[PDB]
């Protein structure tokens, strides 16, 4: 009786939100950006090849200086690369080799990683002993760690396969805030540039916008038909793009609270692993299961170019803070650095 | 062309490369085994004989180092991390023979033995384990014999025309799992009957792994 009545009210509320979004859907982003000229053909060459991982690479993250990057592989090795020289700065042996994510702190003093061990491990890069040591092991998730991102040297946000995200106080080792509401495994998260909000994509084919300080879900974004594997904020923080197993990328708007554009092709039938934007946000770069990275026109939904330099899945990618280059990691155990030429 | 500090940084990178190569060679020699099986299937008892996320068991037997990975504690979506174990030497699957007449606790309407069949079929026919052999442990054989006298296989298998002898009942269950193998040429299934008092379970894994290693070398050379 009471349960049946309540679940009917949820359907009424869902229709109310859907009608509200349709009311403000006066135009389409495709119609708005029809007049602007296309980006043309985007040609990028492999400037660097980072060799040394002996297993599948699962994650990479640039440092804020746009020169150092950290990559994680399931050979149990965290490697920090000097991208200008291809020098290996550090090689961190992981206690658990089943790593799925890695993060570089914006200060450059810490890196984080974690996988099927349900732990986010923090590594100190600047010690008087000259070696990288574990500074914290963040326990509390009951599923695998899918993504982690530093807010500063003391705070980090993690998403897990137990359907929840958590905000951690690194010094105390406790999760100050728990973000619940996903009905599937949360696979990725992206921080807003001001680090006051973050979006997360789960296997319930939905993306939720969370307030870091308040600790509740502000908005929920649906439209995907399969699990979301990747998510990335637009450079101004007012939009984000997702990548799913349905071979599509979608651009959702925070203020319009709805999807704005879909990035899919008929030839593309494989899942998407990673998404990122160029510095101006005009380009959307996505890594795919078909061993390729497709560069999309964010405004016009046109495939601007292809990065074809890997013999297995493109598992991760990232664009430097200065926008100079893009790195692609792959299951073939190699990292490649790309940029164009005049 | 390089400065004094640049040359020293390159030398440090070379030392890191040397250490990465040594670790990879050591890892390649070890045998990786994925330990699978439903709950209350005797899988925990197997680990003790072999002596909150993933549990890794390390043991050595006849100069062979084994790394067994237990993933039963993980309750998340299997398809999001099952590809992480692509490349293991073999998969060890545990099935409790005494659970043929039992009913799944959560579902209350699904046979416990039939629950393992759909799990075995998914793993055996998984795209990530096309060329991976499977070691099948049929546990609780002593308890299975006791239940056979009271409860026949007709409850678990309505379309069973065999007798109720211990040997015939156990053999039929083994053939049921091996028939789920939709790729009988790329992979092989090794079936063993285990018990809590058995001490030859480690030897069977070693013999099965040795057979997998030999066939891997023959396939690599292109002979197969």
């Amino acid at each position, epitope marked *: 009786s009471e349960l049946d009545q309540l679940r009917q009210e949820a359907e009424q509320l869902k229709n109310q939100i859907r009608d509200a979004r349709k009311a403000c859907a006066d135009a389409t982003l495709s119609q708005i950006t029809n007049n602007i000229d296309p980006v043309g053909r985007i040609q990028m060459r492999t400037r660097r090849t980072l060799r040394g991982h002996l297993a599948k690479i699962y994650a990479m993250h640039w440092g804020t200086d746009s020169r150092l990057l950290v990559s994680a592989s399931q050979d149990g090795k965290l490697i920090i690369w000097d991208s200008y020289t291809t020098n290996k700065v550090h090689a961190i042996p992981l206690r658990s080799s089943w790593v799925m994510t890695c993060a570089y702190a914006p200060s450059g003093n810490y890196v984080a990683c974690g996988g099927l061990d349900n732990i986010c491990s923090i590594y100190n890069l600047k010690t008087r002993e000259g070696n990288v040591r574990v500074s914290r092991e963040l326990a509390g998730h009951t599923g695998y760690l899918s993504c982690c991102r530093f807010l500063d040297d003391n705070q980090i946000v993690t998403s897990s396969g137990d359907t929840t995200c958590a905000l951690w106080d690194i010094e105390t080792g406790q999760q100050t805030t728990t973000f619940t509401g996903h009905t599937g495994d949360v696979m990725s998260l992206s921080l807003a540039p001001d680090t006051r909000l973050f979006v997360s994509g789960a296997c319930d084919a939905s993306a939720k916008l969370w307030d870091v300080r308040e600790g509740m879900c502000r908005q929920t974004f649906t439209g995907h038909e399969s699990d979301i594997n990747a998510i990335c904020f637009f450079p101004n923080g007012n939009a984000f793009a997702t990548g799913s197993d349905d071979a599509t990328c979608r651009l959702f708007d925070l203020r319009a609270d709805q999807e704005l554009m879909t990035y899919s092709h008929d030839n593309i039938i494989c899942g998407i692993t990673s998404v990122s934007f160029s510095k101006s946000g005009r380009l959307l770069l996505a890594g795919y299961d078909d061993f390729n990275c497709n560069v999309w026109d964010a405004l016009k939904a046109d495939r601007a170019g292809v990065l074809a330099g890997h013999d297995n899945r493109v598992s991760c990618l990232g664009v430097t803070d200065d926008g100079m280059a893009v790195a692609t990691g792959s299951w073939d155990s190699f990292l490649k650095i790309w940029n164009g030429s005049s | 062309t390089l400065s*004094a500090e640049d040359k020293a940084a390159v030398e440090r990178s070379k030392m890191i490369d040397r250490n990465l190569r040594e670790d990879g060679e050591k890892a390649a020699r070890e045998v990786k085994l994925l330990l699978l099986g439903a709950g209350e299937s005797g899988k925990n008892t197997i680990v003790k004989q072999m002596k909150t996320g993933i549990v890794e068991t390390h043991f050595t037997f006849k100069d062979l180092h084994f790394k067994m990975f237990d993933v039963g504690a993980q309750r998340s979506e299997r398809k999001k991390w099952i590809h992480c174990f692509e490349g293991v030497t073999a998969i060890i699957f545990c099935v409790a023979l005494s659970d043929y007449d039992l009913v799944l606790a959560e579902d209350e309407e699904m046979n416990r033995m039939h629950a393992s069949m759909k799990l075995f079929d998914s793993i055996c026919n998984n795209k990530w384990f096309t060329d991976t052999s499977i070691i099948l442990f049929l546990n609780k054989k002593d308890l299975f014999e006791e239940k056979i006298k009271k409860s026949p296989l007709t409850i678990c298998y309505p379309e069973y025309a065999g007798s109720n002898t211990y040997e015939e009942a156990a053999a039929y269950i083994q053939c049921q799992f091996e028939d789920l193998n939709k790729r009988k040429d790329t992979k092989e299934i090794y079936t063993h009957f285990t018990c809590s008092t058995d001490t030859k379970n480690v030897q069977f894994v070693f013999d099965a792994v040795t057979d997998v290693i030999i066939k891997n070398n023959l396939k690599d050379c292109g002979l197969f």
Partner: single-chain antibody, 231 residues
Framework: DVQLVESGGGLVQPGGSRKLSCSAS????????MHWVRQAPEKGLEWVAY????????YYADTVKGRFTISRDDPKNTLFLQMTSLRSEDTAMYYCVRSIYYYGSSPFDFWGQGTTLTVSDIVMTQATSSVPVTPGESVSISCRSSKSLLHSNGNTYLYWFLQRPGQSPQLLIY???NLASGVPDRFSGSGSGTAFTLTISRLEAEDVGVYYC?????????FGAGTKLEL
């Protein structure tokens, strides 16, 4: 804590042999390259030798090449300096210096206490030998080099050290602008090409000492004469 203890120094006869040891504790010894730096009594610093991490690269100063042998024992965390045919020119305090090299590292960051031995090329110039100073006042120290220390990679391999009276040298500024760990922000290093300045805002009692500018562009590493601050 990070420690570097030297031993084996003492009075030796001319033409003799002596073995200096540097025991390291509290840090990953095998990860650091090691230098020997000596200082003649009432004189400036003089670089002696270098052995890299992993013992693959070894460099010597010309004045000691062929007579000195530098070696390390990574399992024992001990650095050695075998000296032969010792001359009166070798009478100095010999310092054990650790230095690690990767992008953004701070070489020459920690020095040992040193051991005293008594026996019976880019030019770095510090023309100002002494500078009278008062507490709370800003002081600038100048250094010059015969060659440009700015490399084509953008680094300017100039280092600043402070040797307080009775103490081992401490790193202040590495690569001409970066501030070493544990050094107050009042120290600032500024330079261009061949001319460099170390500015000390709001000088304090601890800052009193001799300041050395060292180049790390190429071997042999050379020190300036040193500028002394006195009250």
């Amino acid at each position: 804590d990070v420690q570097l203890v030297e031993s084996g120094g003492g009075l030796v006869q001319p033409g003799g042999s002596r073995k200096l040891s540097c025991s390291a504790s509290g840090f990953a010894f095998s990860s650091f390259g090691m230098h020997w730096v000596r200082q003649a009594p009432e004189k400036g610093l003089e670089w002696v030798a270098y052995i890299s991490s992993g013992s693959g690269t070894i460099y010597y100063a010309d004045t000691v090449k062929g007579r000195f042998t530098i070696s390390r024992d990574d399992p024992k965390n001990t650095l050695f300096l075998q000296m032969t045919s010792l001359r009166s020119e070798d009478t100095a305090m010999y310092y054990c210096v650790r230095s690690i090299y990767y992008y953004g590292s701070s070489p020459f960051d920690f020095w040992g206490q040193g051991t005293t031995l008594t026996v019976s090329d880019i030019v770095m110039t510090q023309a100002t030998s002494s500078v009278p100073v008062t507490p709370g006042e800003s002081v600038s120290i100048s250094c010059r080099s015969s060659k440009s220390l700015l490399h084509s990679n953008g680094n300017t391999y100039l280092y600043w050290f402070l040797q307080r009276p009775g103490q081992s040298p401490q790193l202040l500024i590495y690569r001409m602008s970066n501030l070493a760990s544990g050094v107050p922000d009042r120290f600032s290093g500024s330079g261009s090409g061949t001319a460099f300045t170390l500015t000390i805002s709001r000088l304090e009692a601890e800052d009193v000492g001799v300041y050395y500018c060292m180049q790390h562009l190429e071997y042999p590493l050379t020190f300036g004469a040193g500028t002394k601050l006195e009250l």
